[model samples]
Target: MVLSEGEWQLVLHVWAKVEADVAGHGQDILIRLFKSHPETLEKFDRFKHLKTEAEMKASEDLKKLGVTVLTALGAILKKKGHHEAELKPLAQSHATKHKIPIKYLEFISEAIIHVLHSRHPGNFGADAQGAMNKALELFRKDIAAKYKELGYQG
Candidate 1:
């Protein structure tokens, strides 16, 4: 899809805000994505459940990452480089625990970016978008690696 520059701006802003756990950023961002293109849900079996669980789990994970991002937000303002490296194994193990497909990892990544950017134009910036994309990449890699560890290959 061809997204406008304003759309990208919104995405970056929302990502930054969510790190702060601004009230309803989770619901706003993801809901925007799902609502914008409901077809994206086709990739998952339990779309609503997965999104909800992701929001909950992501909230849990964000405590540390959010702090890290905030501390480095202005210093080393680049997309998360090694964060995904650590997350890959974690996602893999977690997915295995849930007995869910590793594919959802990719789906979640795509859905989040599209939704977050489209919904929150006031918070996300280009820098935030870059960071968000990097984080999502790490998450996807995390799931892929975890699945491999669990004898899941495709």
Candidate 2:
């Protein structure tokens, strides 16, 4: 999915605004991700036992994870075509070291789109959403390949 210059501009524009409220947006998305797929919580020892979204957000480790994810996403937006380069190692770590399945990437991407649509309704239109979807799909594709390389069957 090739994005037009205008779409790219919109992506960056929305990203800047989102980056400013990293904690807010990130936590919201994290909550949604957990709600959407509770099994993912098992991957995080710090948050595994948390039963609720609010409880999950209370952990400093959870907060830091949110910040790290959004920060890495921001970095990926800053560089075009280098999404794989930026995300491959992280995927490998999660797959090989952390034992997280590659399937969670899709859940995370879904939460991202949900957050953008729900939180930034005014700015997140078809073009913006499409651009984001493309970017995330690229990231997931790379991550999946890395997971495969690491012999992650799931």
Candidate 3:
């Protein structure tokens, strides 16, 4: 799915808000991921033991991870065309070192979508949601390809 200029603008606008409160928003997204997909917690050594949101919020390492992820996502949104500068390394590292499956990456998209809609309320309209959805689809496709090459076997 390709994003038109207007759609890209919509995505950028919504993401700008996320960037403003990276730690809070990023943590929220990660929390949603863990809450919705409990299996995801096993992949992170730091998060595996955490059962409560309070514990997750208190972990500095996890908060740093959230910052790193949200920053990379913002970078992806800023780039033009089929870019992989940030995502390639991220995907490869997750597939290799982290041993995180591609499906969990997809789950992140689901969490972000929910976060945007719920957090922004009236501001995150359908157009913005669609843009973010397509952007994430492309991002996941690239990450999934890397996972395949890294012997993830999807």
Candidate 4:
């Protein structure tokens, strides 16, 4: 259901590679996400017209959005998923309040893996990528659990 200690270490090892480029990595993931699912763009009023990768790369707001995501991930990695339960409320909001489809989280995770693979083709091998996938799977499932608790089907 979750990554083992060794897996987390592998994930952390690669995570450190992008520490200096958190915003860039996050931005690439978001851009890839938007490219994969255009509907997500409508959810962001500020990024509604960010249709191109170059556009996304240049937008200051998009930069902030990217950094925000990385910052959240930073917390999770730092807390070693011990802080995962703290996300219950945020997940509830994503469902009950934000009404975001749970699939978006999946899309985001997909984008993350893709970004990591593309950014560091050699460093992000199967082991590290698989570890990231497991961590993100845990993240997605918890959010979906909240959606289930709220009686929303996705």
Candidate 5:
């Protein structure tokens, strides 16, 4: 779930906060990321993704895609750690395209983090969520040049 032991606890702790929710209230979380406040990419240089600011906006299609990955995410967590072995397959690249999977990976990761914090404000503080965000940021970096091609800052 994270790079350091401490952060892993943060991930697991808040995850337990969503212990029932990932499968229960998960639609709210997924829909929030895809729909609610609309996290807005709402800025990007948009290269390989060539993603329009408006285009990153919500779609049932993208939300539907997120649902599967979020499901995988729960299993990946229970399977015991390491985003490399766990999440790599969730973002597998095809012969034709690589953008969609990786792009959504970005979205859902933040979505889970947001749900944890927003759902349990007193328990899951900013640092707790930020630790997970940074951990996932590391997972983001472990992937190859395609993301580099996509533009990290973007």
Candidate 6:
């Protein structure tokens, strides 16, 4: 499948929107990713679901700080392309805050795009690459906003 710009934006937006639906949706996405790729389980505490009550609670503060970042990103991506430079540092910072390795973060992000691809083959077709890019953009914006609130500037 070749990912499209729109499809990619959709995935990214949906992934970020999950936080509104459930507190640990991001971590839950990771849990599913590890499950789908069992070998990666060795990289993290795999037996348990990543989304715990504690994780949900802790996400509250991050969520609050993310408002501006998300909004700004939506505006930016609508016009300009995904801001890769701004996003990576933000993601790395969040990884540090969560004590998760940057490698694991990339794995989780890629895994999520994979999940979306399997679930929506027709939708993500012919533009999977673009979709992945958009999703990564979404991750960066979301994590950056969360990290900035925690005092980790981009």
Per residue, candidate 4 scores C-alpha lDDT tens digits across 1-154 of 7568999898888888889788878778888889998888887877897768888888989989889878877777666667656676676767776678878888788888898898887878998898889888877777677688878847
- Candidate 1 residues lying further than 4 Å off, grouped into runs, are 1-14, 29-79, 84-89, 122-131
Pairs of residues clashing in candidate 1 = 10-121, 11-117, 12-124, 12-125, 13-123, 13-124, 13-125, 14-124, 88-142, 92-146
The clash tally of candidate 5 reads: 0
Identify the superior model by lDDT, candidate 1 or candidate 4: 4
The alpha-carbon lDDT assigned to residue 93 of candidate 6 equals 46
- Mark the regions of model 4 whose C-alpha exceeds 4 Å error after superposition: 151-153
C-alpha lDDT values of all predictions: 0.49, 0.81, 0.83, 0.81, 0.55, 0.51
- At residue 115, candidate 5 shows an lDDT of 71
In terms of TM-score, how similar is model 2 to the real structure? 0.89
Worst 10 residues of 3 by lDDT: 80-89
Candidate 2 runs further than 4 Å off: 1-4
Worst 10 residues of 2 by lDDT: 1-10
How does candidate 1 score on lDDT?
Answer: 0.49
lDDT at residue 152 of model 1 (Cα atoms): 71
User: Which one is best on lDDT?
Assistant: 3
lDDT digits (tens) for residues 1-154 of candidate 3: 5778887888888888888799988898999999999999998876799989899989888888889889988888888446766767887777778877667778889999999999986768887888888888888787787778777745
Per-residue error (Å), model 2, residue 101? 2.3
Q: After superposition, how far is residue 123 of candidate 1 from its true place, in Å?
A: 5.0
Q: Name model 6 segments beyond 4 Å from true.
A: 1-28, 36-96, 134-154
Residue 18 alpha-carbon offset, candidate 5, angstroms: 1.2
- Taking all chains together, each candidate's TM-score versus the true structure is 0.47, 0.89, 0.92, 0.89, 0.59, 0.41
Error of 1 at 33 (Å): 6.7
lDDT of 5: 0.55
